[PDB]
Amino acid sequence: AHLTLKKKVQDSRRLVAEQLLGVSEVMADFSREIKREREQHFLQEEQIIEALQHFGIEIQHVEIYSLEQGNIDIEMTIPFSGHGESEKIIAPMLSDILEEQILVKAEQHSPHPNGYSHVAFGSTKSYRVSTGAAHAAKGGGLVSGDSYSMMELGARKYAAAISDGMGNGARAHFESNETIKLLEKILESGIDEKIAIKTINSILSLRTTDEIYSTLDLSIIDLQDASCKFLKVGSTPSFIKRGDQVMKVQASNLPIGIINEFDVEVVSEQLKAGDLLIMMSDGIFEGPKHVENHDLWMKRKMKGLKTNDPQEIADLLMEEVIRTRSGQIEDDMTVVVVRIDHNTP
Amino acid sequence: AHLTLKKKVQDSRRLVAEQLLGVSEVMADFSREIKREREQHFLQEEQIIEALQHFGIEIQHVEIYSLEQGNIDIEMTIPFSGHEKIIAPMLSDILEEQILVKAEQHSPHPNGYSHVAFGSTKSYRVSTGAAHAAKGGGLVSGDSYSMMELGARKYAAAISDGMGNGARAHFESNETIKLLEKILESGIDEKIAIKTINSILSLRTTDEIYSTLDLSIIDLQDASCKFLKVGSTPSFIKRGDQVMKVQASNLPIGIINEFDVEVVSEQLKAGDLLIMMSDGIFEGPKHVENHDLWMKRKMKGLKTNDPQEIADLLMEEVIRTRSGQIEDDMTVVVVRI
């Protein structure tokens, strides 16, 4: 409730600049963070070659292909020698990485007095992951307004994202499918997840509307110690099932765009082997039209599930929401399940 | 190739990272370019207040609302005085454009009440017109266009195509122009504004990934034009009876080319007609070898200067080459000076 100020084109021009300066800040903040990751691995590489010279080990042949904390892969070649010397030179190799355990793969191919022993070292992963999902559209036809994806990023972590958006058929998929495709590439870079969401949230800021773009739900399970990073930027609830318990995780923040200041909060939970992480969109959680308490209804539905296969769990919950109606589907429905259990190699 | 590249996921993610550093590079360069203009507007502002002070009227309460080379608008307060001569030097220190007067003398009394406002001057009036059509002749077309004015200095016109189908391409075309409508509005170098759009739209590292673009910028200062073409989409200029075609060798939007986009400049005068079309109109007539010579004879047959009629009478004539069929999305934009 102010004056007129009808010469407002300049006020819009300089305001759009701050939108372009704001996103340029998170891009520069992303550039210095990835450069910091380049300097750590480079410093780790220098520290590794000095440690070899000092310890009584032979530098007959060496090749370093890549050195990420998740995907550790280096190759060496040393004289044949004898006994457990191929692995007791690895004890300092674990300590030089300071964080990761290293295993040995020794390929000795020289049935002659001359020494030709080629060896490769790789990272170790714990907790094997099993996946499965169920998909459904509002009209049950062709393409749904909800999009999901779940891919593994090397050895360390398994990712799972779900995006919603608008309710229209074509108007919501092209906007929801693009979010996951943009997230599927930014998460592949190996950047901090809390920063990766601000970077996606900044790029997708368009028109300065309310609830502009695709809401999203990201869950990343670290295989190092079976920890999870619950990132909710779509305000969609998620659940964890351990035997017969059902623990609900939720977070306060608004959809993707520039709807909130001071970005997105992270939520962490600790799980063990045999646990079941199920996620759904708003079409399943608010699916049944004749239900008041959607939290108790979703908890009791899982306690009746008597299986550990993640594929069946996604379907028995999906069709149970359909059972509450006369086969009706009043909204786009999507559910993703992930199970955790050790490798036991 | 080389080895069997077992753990390519490491080599494939370092490449995706470098793609994301490239767009982060032009974004930091975009920030330094607008900061350069913000330091230019600030350095000129300090240059203004000392020149305004040295005068028998004193600065009093001068108000500078905004000072970009396109929209110059400032207000001052001066004594009643009598017989605008303070604006001829005010135009010289800014070193560009021209300034007009707008001084209204309120209170016809020997008081010192007198408000004044100064604004930029624009030359060469623009006239617009376009024609729209869908692939199946339906409601949803794969081509999207827009033509808005950015203050006083320039009139813009963009056309994007993309895929052939109506649904898969309507989102990619509508998104390109909406993203272009915000990057051009910020006020930045046109050559750098294109590398900003193309870097953001780099996704999946495919061939001919996203929407091809056709940008035409008409400067109202001296009637110069900046032809920016991403996708080798031809355009034409009509002056009386001449038909000049502009083209560029660069490839569609994405990261399909290195060393960014070449800029093309042209000089036009009054009465000229800038027409633009997508690949659905230029390749409209299917039983034609030379699409350029065919399009040239069609414009010499156009006998009107109304930009709206030119867009329809050219589009409807492309339909006549077929049996009323529309084999692809069609879009044409006409601009007169």
Numbering used by the authors:
A (entry chain A): 465 to 809
B (entry chain B): 465 to 547, 551 to 804
What's the publication's text?
We investigated the PP2C family member SpoIIE, which controls the activation of the cell-specific transcription factor σF during the developmental process of sporulation in the bacterium Bacillus subtilis. SpoIIE is the most upstream member of a three-protein pathway that activates σF in the small cell. It does so by dephosphorylating the phosphoprotein SpoIIAA-P. Dephosphorylated SpoIIAA, in turn, displaces σF from the anti-sigma factor SpoIIAB to release the free and active transcription factor. Like other PP2C family phosphatases, the catalytic center of SpoIIE uses two divalent cations (manganese in the case of SpoIIE) to deprotonate a water molecule that serves as the nucleophile for dephosphorylation.
Using bioinformatic analysis, we devised a construct (SpoIIE457–827) that included the C-terminal half of the regulatory domain and the PP2C phosphatase domain (information on the design of the construct is presented in the Materials and methods). This construct produced monodisperse protein that yielded crystals. Despite limited (3.9 Å) resolution of the diffraction data, the overall secondary structure elements were well-defined in electron density maps for both the regulatory and the phosphatase domains. The five molecules of SpoIIE457-827 in the asymmetric unit were paired in similar dimers; two dimers were formed within the asymmetric unit and the fifth molecule dimerized across a crystallographic two-fold axis. The core of the dimer interface (1500–2000 Å2 buried surface per monomer) was formed from antiparallel contacts between the long α-helices from the regulatory domains of adjacent molecules. The effect of these substitutions on stabilization and subcellular localization was investigated by use of a SpoIIE-YFP fusion and the effect on phosphatase activity was judged by use of a σF-dependent reporter (red circles). The results revealed that a continuous region of the dimer interface (marked with red circles in Figure 2B) composed of six residues from the long α-helix of the regulatory domain (V480, L484, V487, M491, F494, and I498) and three residues from the switch helices (L646, I650, and T663) were needed for all three aspects of SpoIIE function. Comparison of the SpoIIE590–827 structures with SpoIIE457–827 revealed that dimerization rotated the switch helices (α1 and α2 of the PP2C fold, corresponding to SpoIIE residues 630–678) approximately 45° as a rigid body relative to the phosphatase core. In the dimer, the switch helices are held in position by intramolecular contacts with the long α-helix of the regulatory domain and intermolecular contacts between switch helices across the dimer interface. In the dimeric SpoIIE457–827 structure and in contrast to the SpoIIE590–827 structure, the loop connecting the switch helices to G629 was ordered and overlaid well with M2-containing structures of closely related phosphatases such as B. subtilis RsbX, M. tuberculosis Rv1364c, and S. thermophilus Sthe_0969.
